[model samples]
Target: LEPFQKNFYIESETVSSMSEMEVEELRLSLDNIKIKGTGCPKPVTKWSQLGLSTDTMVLITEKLHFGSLTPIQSQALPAIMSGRDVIGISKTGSGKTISYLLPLLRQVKAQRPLSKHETGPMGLILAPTRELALQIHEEVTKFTEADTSIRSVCCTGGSEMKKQITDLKRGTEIVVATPGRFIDILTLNDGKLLSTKRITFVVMDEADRLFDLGFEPQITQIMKTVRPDKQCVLFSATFPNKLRSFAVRVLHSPISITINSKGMVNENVKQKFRICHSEDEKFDNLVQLIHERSEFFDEVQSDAKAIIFVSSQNICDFISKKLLNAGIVTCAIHAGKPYQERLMNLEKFKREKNSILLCTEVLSRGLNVPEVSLVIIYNAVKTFAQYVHTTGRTARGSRSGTAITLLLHDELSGAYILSKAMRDEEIKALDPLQAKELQEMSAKFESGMKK
Candidate 1:
């Protein structure tokens, strides 16, 4: 058990403060949602219910066609709308895009309309990848129609800095950005282009990935620029203890909400694992699954969309060639490649839809592509989180998807970790024999660590 810290949990009331009557209804609304922190305002269902502007409600209910509140929306929107810092952990397909955003819009409305001389990006959203920042920019744009005055811009490293400067100069209300570029922009013209003074809210989507990408210093630097009173929240599949404790400093006595997603991966993915005796054997199975023979490729309605994940850049390139040898066209994306090529290839896979994308684990965390209905783990993943993220790449939102993992006995240690999650209260991917084998592998791996 973790020895709880003295000033660890911010004392916030979300559920325990509720009257039993509201709590009864709240129970079902929870879907087992757990909240820890102080005096969070109650959850609400309708967009109109949260004091959001009438124009925004029209966009949400009619123009946007959003339905009943998602559980994350139910939990997160109210706390954030109530002007409290929040730490929300949600699963794949939870559609948290709505939660962080709607409340942010509400908060933007509260921060009093900007004055003439004021610079923009009153809110800053940090995303790990330029792709997801763009995706969030697009998603936020859909709602910004409610008030064209509340403009947002997507700023990242690979993109042209000139256009982004133009948008900020034109007075945007929100910046959807990758940390490095945002910091670069923040320092431009001796930090004259952007100012943190008007900033009211801060958000980090998939913050673990941000830190994983070594944005820790960037975040602290960002915090130093923004005044201390700002509202901040982090949304992720998992919050590392390091981040949680680290967050204690920045979050300003926050309320943490676990959306019960810790329980499992998305229910929408079909998981298939084939154990391979050799690297060549794994390649052989991959070919068969894609084109040669397998139930896998036969069921796709259109040309299939897939992300084949390899371990290293060399392996990624080698696999790119092997796939080409089998007449499969592929786009390779990894951090080692030129940013333009990575971005272009990502677009090729996303825009073209039928194209297969091969990548390293660099794209694994929080890069959601709705068109990617399939993921092939060409290399076995190392951790349960990596396993969850790799497989979870597919089955974004409501789409049904598939994940096929090729395993090697040499790495059955990792197999034990993946198999345990494969049936995490959701699926039956492991046969009894496979379960037994994984347990044996698990034990052997544990003992070997002692050496």
Candidate 2:
């Protein structure tokens, strides 16, 4: 691989070279979907513009009822379909999956019919965490359901490896995986299910993390095995300089597309911060917030579903225990938990509306739980990336939600991140009533203990 080189920049000559009508169409599309890059195709306003088969279009529009593509999907699909390597930067839950998936699906279909016998995955999707991998696999299942011939499997660390092997051995075209488990399976002499020689489409979902020190080696190893002529796509909420250099080395003549500015949180999420002097105070505020949404708020019609993100696995269990003791239906998931238990807890939280999911960063990045109307940062966020990903758990797609960060005195840096989110009216203070309630409840609890 080439040593890290000069600053990476995507040439914008392709956009400048477009005809007036084409440029105007691109402009109108960008009204909702912000994009910039060379070789960028005009956005597909509707699913029909992607030139999918009639059956595929029906599945997308009629069956899935996804009448139009998201801004990212609108812009990214055509560029990807044109066989350009792409670096797609967009906020979480912006339908980024379909932006790459649709083009890959179309390409896969055009290349050849699927064989009934066992075969290697044609497309490899690498995610940083297991939850994100599973989520991607679920979406893959939904898109490929109508056409049973297109099979996909998820390979993650916590789940049963044997079952994953079985799925892969049965026959598959797409593989959604965490980098570690993927490399492990690839190196396994006997347990391995497939090969990467045919992987023509390699997508680094949460690409920002794929290049991090922990995952970089495995990613490099995986890339070495894949076909050199493959189309490599990287999608992330934020792109660090490291990722830019890494992208330069791996992707040839890539189209760099950033939707809106990088590091900008989702506009749909309403963010508010509360200062907590201690863990007890934060817990008190948490209890009050849940109580209000469950009992007092008429505007929040959905069941009270929330995720509380902490830094440590110990904190996950501690907070979960306290919530359970306080009669808040809760479950915990973290790296410390076993595979089955984490899956069971996650399902429990997802299936039960009145459930509180206490988790670590594992739940943050790309796991989409639409019912999560609230997210509480019960601890200080070490980085703005964590803050964005944690808050992103709520306010997904068109659904409006809330993120309440309980910050300590020294953790005002976390508050600064909230201000960045607050810019451009993206986030706002908590409702006056709710803010007052949280303060009063914390004070009352302090008084009660004193008595």
Candidate 3:
């Protein structure tokens, strides 16, 4: 009762301003969220300390088995739960989703009127891709499934619209959707499918990709329909000036939380550059790397997989076919393929062992493939953000992984930029520290891959 009383007061914002001691405590909490390197166990910090309800904490710890909050989750959850708009910047796979999801679910639970059933969703989540939208919807359902009062639906392109409408009609409190499909639903049958008047919590996952994919206009249009007093949270893996401008327009009086230095790769994932003298050399290099991983003795090592990111679907097809002809099992995925095939390939890649998933930029952002031990950038990445997203496919959730980029001669300009990007990590092709760490990481990954 004493613990609940203290937390309940803090949760309700009954205290107008924090005292000096309280501010210092907040500072200590922020400082405590650290990234111990690969295979190093992170200390478990209870969700209760962050002023979350016991029920919420139970769902997070007991139900989810998420031993503790990740760094981003630790930093962002407090401000979000306090009802402030938030912009969270962290590297990929750093538990960004749970940070906002818990707060959003709590807000919806607390503020929702008991007797009134609104036509609109109380919470909204928008992602840049269908896969990302679906992933978020799964998490929302997982968190809220025990409570029948809270319902969620996922709407994205390449799915049956009729089915989505059915889900909404069944009373969804949360709507996880891609921007285009969300807009379609918003305007369907003279805006009859859904309403925006009751929405109080909105989130934009992969905010940078939303703008880069030219969903800015759609986002603005959707926001126009949303209540002005709503709380908005934007989570992005990278924060460039372009994203900054977009966020400024969307978020209101937002508390900005940056988990780590921006534009740097996750430390758990070692970075390496492989310079290819010619096109043929690059092709042969990719084959050689994949073939070398054919056999391993351990069970975890047998599940090792790789994703080779190309620049275009044409190149993806060419590489996929080439790898197959070489007796390597692989699949290609891009926006050009049928929706069913793309989902199937992604699922297959997730299930198979020692497999290669060939793809373009479409798979770069917000796709969770933890078994990916290596990410091969077969083509020169045009942007630092693209490089970050591609490499982020591995090293998810404290596990170590590797990123190998194939650099062509004319790609020196991009390499120079990449050097600046890696500077914060103190990583270079010849950095002894990086080489030693990677060697240890590689050995661990190999030992785990055996049957």
Candidate 4:
């Protein structure tokens, strides 16, 4: 109920001085809480039966795919398994990837890998960023492990293209990749790697990020490498402007499955905001705030973890280093780091050895880390996609958690505009003193502009 909310990434305050007793009380309340599936009323009853009726090898294999069906999955799997185009948009953390993964894995396993004589790739999944691409690769690996007949390779930037090209040359049944890498290979060797004439089964993961963030060129370029009549599927957190054109041009009267009306956050997570001033003060304020609650560390679950979101990799490194120096277990990951290093940091975070994970928008969307309680967005992102992804990190698995967005005074105007667009009225900018202290360090950061 404080003054001001802006249209962009709000500045944030890290957990400062939460008392052990206070945290215990919070956890006690959540312990009795129930997190349930967001099932649609009246259910997609007929859609759920789509794969059930199909005897095709693809449909059969996916029906047995691990993990029970989420509502979106129930709606998406059938149409996708049956080789019909599909468009799926859902909430931030509502299992959209699995919705398409089930069918994709099944179809890829059932069909033969495209041969050198065939085309560039078959059964492709494109992600907006390398982190997301890698995430989808992880999921694909988990489900496909029992059946090793199909080989899946992730081709994203940060690695040598020659190696990825070597992988493509080796014959892959399924490829999980970023659009840029996929397109690079599609046109490499004088367009010898990919042939639009033979490829089939295109799945664009994070459709909103790809299309709206201006990844459409790479998407279209990669699509041109696939057959004009290929079966296309899209899974995204939300549907934006380009969806209609994409459907009309690429897919043919595809059925859609949405997790909710649209642009919703999970009911399991609790969200809040803090006001700040300038960039530099944001870090200092976070350092001060989280320290106050230091005694609460013992109350976290054995696998407990936390994620802090920021706008840039430098800030990620800066904050992570600061926390580590303060004896808070933490590590930083971002697009700027080497691919293997990024993976290693993620592994450490997952192991709970590094209790705090600091990153950019990567951890903000569709990631499945379960033990996170505090999702502290050190800075609010300018776009709704970024906001949804960042806040979506906490309060998973029938648990309760908090999302705190820190906002500076000047940015409050823009932040309010963004909140309006997202229909989120709960965002509150911090008071002048708090905002000034929160964003002081952020103002000193020079490279974060235009990003």
Model 2 CA deviation exceeding 4 Å by range:
1-37, 113-118, 190-192, 262-451
Model 1 regions lying over 4 Å from their true place: 1-25, 261-451
Model 1 C-alpha lDDT per residue in residues 280-374, reported as the tens digit of each score = 99999899877733354455434568889988889988998988988888888877888787778877778774678888887655454554778
- Per-residue lDDT of 24-100 in model 2, one digit per residue for the tens? 43543342344545656665566655567788787777877885566677677778888889889888988889888
- Residue-level lDDT of model 3, residues 1-451, one tens digit each, is 0011001114323223455444433333332232321221122245765656676668777877776567677657766766678788778988889978987888777654523445668899999999999999999998887787788889987558788887776566889999988888887757766878778889999988998999989999989888777889999888889888877777776777776453356777877776667989999998888766664425335467888889888888888888888988787788788979988988898887667888887665645556478888899775555666677777575786888888775564446535544534455456685444444543554345332
Q: Return the top candidate by TM-score.
A: 1
Q: How many steric overlaps are in each model, in order?
A: 6, 0, 9, 50
TM-score (C-alpha, index-matched) for candidate 2: 0.53
Using lDDT as the measure, which candidate wins? 1
Write model 4 residue lDDT over 240-310, tens digit each, in one string. Answer: 66775776577766766655442345656666556666766877777765764455655553345667888
In candidate 2 the C-alpha lDDT for residue 249 amounts to 93
Least well predicted 10-residue stretch by lDDT in candidate 4:
2-11
Instruction: Assess candidate 3 and give its lDDT.
Output: 0.72
RMSD, candidate 1, Å: 22.2
Off by more than 4 A, model 3? 1-45, 51-55, 113-117, 262-451
Better of 1 and 3 by lDDT: 1
- Which ranges in model 4 have alpha carbons more than 4 Å from their true place? 1-68, 194-197, 262-451
lDDT of 4: 0.61
lDDT of each: 0.75, 0.73, 0.72, 0.61
